[PDB]
């Protein structure tokens, strides 16, 4: 079943531009993943204004983050609109999305004339690739109302997509899972991530939770808002 794909040339070049742009600010990857989740949440919310059964698969609209230090994984899950198999292949593997080409051009000039590019990335919502600053592997599990649950996975040298054998566990939404580099083990620490989630979510119109503990050990979603 597992079908392999090569990234489109432009995306390879875009990945490199993005990476070298935030290379001294690796922490910004989290802000972009949260921003992406926010976008996905706004889409499903707008769709709910028309489609009455829009939220059936998952009546909540949240962003939930969890550190799995023991597995060296960081997970960013949203109950947003999700992506069908085709959207996983197209949105992550190519520049087809309308204004992505515009970003490639502006981001290239800006970077040339010493202008800030940090805002461009957030502006055109192409911050997903900054995950490769702290991850050796990025896995995107997604469930869209019009398709079954799939998994996209990449080490940046190519990518695969397979139907998720685990069935439909998300309900609706997306999970970005990062297999962190050694140099980034820090992002496995609750205190660190929790701090980042707050410094980058105070402007999100959706509730943002981090799976934290007290310590007898109590585990539950802590609202960072
Ligand atoms: N979390 C995401 N949810 C949805 Cl529905 N789409 C996403 C998400 N993260 C990334 N994408 C899509 C939109 C931008 C594109 C390239 O980063 O991939």
Nearest residue to 184 (alpha-carbon basis) of 74, 77, 76: 74
Q: Where do the domains of the chain lie, and which CATH numbers do they carry?
A: 1-225 (3.30.565.10)
Q: According to the annotation, is 78 in a ligand binding site?
A: yes
Residue 15: helix, strand or coil by DSSP? Answer: helix
Resolution (Å units)? 2.1
- Whole-number Å distance, alpha carbon 215 to ligand 1 midpoint, is 35
Sign, CA dihedral 147-150-154-158, equals: negative
Method for this entry: X-ray
Cβ neighbors of 84 (< 8 A, separation 6 or more) are: 144, 146, 147, 150
Q: According to the annotation, is 168 in a ligand binding site?
A: no
DSSP type of residue 156 = S
Measured CA distances, 14 to 76, 112, 153, 203 (Å): 22, 14, 18, 27
Counting atoms of ligand 1 from 1, which one is nearest the CA of 127? 17
Distance of alpha carbon 136 from alpha carbon 47, whole angstroms? 34
């Amino acid at each position: 079943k597992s079908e392999k794909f090569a990234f489109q040339a432009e995306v390879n070049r875009m990945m490199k531009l993005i990476i070298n742009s935030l290379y001294k600010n690796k922490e910004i990857f989290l802000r972009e993943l949260i921003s992406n989740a926010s976008d996905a949440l706004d889409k499903i919310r707008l769709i709910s204004l028309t489609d009455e059964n829009a939220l059936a698969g998952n009546e909540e609209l949240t962003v939930k983050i969890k550190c799995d230090k023991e597995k060296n994984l960081l997970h960013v899950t949203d109950t947003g609109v999700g992506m069908t198999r085709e959207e996983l292949v197209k949105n992550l593997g190519t520049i087809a999305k309308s204004g992505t080409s515009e970003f490639l051009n502006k981001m290239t000039e800006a970077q040339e004339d010493g202008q800030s590019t940090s805002e461009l990335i957030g502006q055109f919502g192409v911050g997903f690739y900054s995950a490769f600053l702290v991850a050796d592997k990025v896995i995107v599990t997604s469930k869209h109302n019009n398709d079954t649950q799939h998994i996209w996975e990449s080490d940046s040298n190519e990518f695969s997509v397979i139907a998720d054998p685990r069935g439909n566990t998300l309900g609706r939404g997306t999970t970005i899972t990062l297999v962190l580099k050694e140099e980034a083990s820090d992002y496995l620490e609750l205190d660190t991530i929790k701090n980042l989630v707050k410094k980058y979510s105070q402007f999100i119109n959706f509730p943002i939770y981090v799976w934290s503990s007290k310590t007898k050990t109590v585990w539950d979603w802590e609202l960072m808002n």
